[PDB]
Amino acid sequence: MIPSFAPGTLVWLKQDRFPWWPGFVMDPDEVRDITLPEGSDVWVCCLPRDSLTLSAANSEDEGQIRYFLPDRDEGMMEEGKLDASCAVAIEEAIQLYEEQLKAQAGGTNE
Numbered sequence: 001m002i003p004s005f006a007p008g009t010l011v012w013l014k015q016d017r018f019p020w021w022p023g024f025v026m027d028p029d030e031v032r033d034i035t036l037p038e039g040s041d042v043w044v045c046c047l048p049r050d051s052l053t054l055s056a057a058n059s060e061d062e063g064q065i066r067y068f069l070p071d072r073d074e075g076m077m078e079e080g081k082l083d084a085s086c087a088v089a090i091e092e093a094i095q096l097y098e099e100q101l102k103a104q105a106g107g108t109n110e
Contacts, residue, residue, distance in 0.1 A: 003027035010093040014064035021046050024093050047089035
């Protein structure tokens with residue numbers, strides 16, 4: 001049960017004409033075992049700014065992407081110490097990831 005290769009990972013999406021913004025990696029319905037025709041296999045949930053700018057693409061998004069987690073890749077400073085929206089988005093992503101991934105990884109002494 002590992003859809004979108006480890007579901008719940010926060011990465012960075014850098015558009016060609018657009019800048020680089022944070023986005024949580026989420027699967028539409030497990031596209032790792034079941035591959036059906038549509039056009040969107042990956043669902044990136046960016047921070048609240050454009051009113052749910054969820055980006056959906058199937059083997060089409062391969063431009064520029066960065067792996068975020070340790071918040072020490074010389075970016076957290078601008079994604080937390082710059083815009084309150086970035087700091088809140090990241091804090092929330094980690095607050096949930098460590099709340100759902102830990103709850104099913106030994107909740108209450110397993």
